[PDB]
Amino acid sequence: LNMRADLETYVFQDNLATAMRRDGEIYQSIVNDIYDVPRNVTITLEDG
Amino acid sequence: KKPETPEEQQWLVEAQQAKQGQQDPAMVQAQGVLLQGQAELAKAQNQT
């Protein structure tokens, strides 16, 4: 429980120093088209 | 299962309808070994 408390402050400490490190994996970058922003998310449209 | 889109989307939905399209002729084709016995009824009418 205290280990999980250390891991609770892990995200609120490490991410500042190292930079970034938002979780998950989502298409935002080059190699074909970019971003994911417009409207609703959708099945294989908007950036294709 | 249906798509939960964990890191992949385009390949899921594409091959989903394609796999379902393979199932329909395949089950009927599986009867092909027993179609030999059904062909005896066809040959029975052919010889006459």
Contact (Cβ atoms closer than 8 angstroms) between residue A33 and residue A48? yes
Cβ neighbours, 10 Å, residue A7: 9
Nearest to A48 by CA among A26, A33, A29: A33
B9 contacts A43? CB cut-off 8 A: yes
Q: How far is B19 from chain A (nearest CA, A)?
A: 18
Structure-token pair, residue A46 = 């908007």
Query: How far is it, in rounded angstroms, from Cα A44 to Cα B14?
Result: 10
What b/e string do you get for B9-28 counting C-beta neighbours within 10 Å, with b at 16 or more? beebeeeeeeeeeeeeeeee
Nearest to A12 by CA among A21, A3, A1: A21
Q: How far is A24 from chain B (nearest CA, A)?
A: 9
Query: How far is it, in rounded angstroms, from Cα B19 to Cα B12?
Result: 10
Query: Which of A25, A43, A44 is facing B7, going by the closest CB pair?
Result: A25
- Resolution in Å, one decimal place: 10.5
Query: How far is it, in rounded angstroms, from Cα B48 to Cα B36?
Result: 19
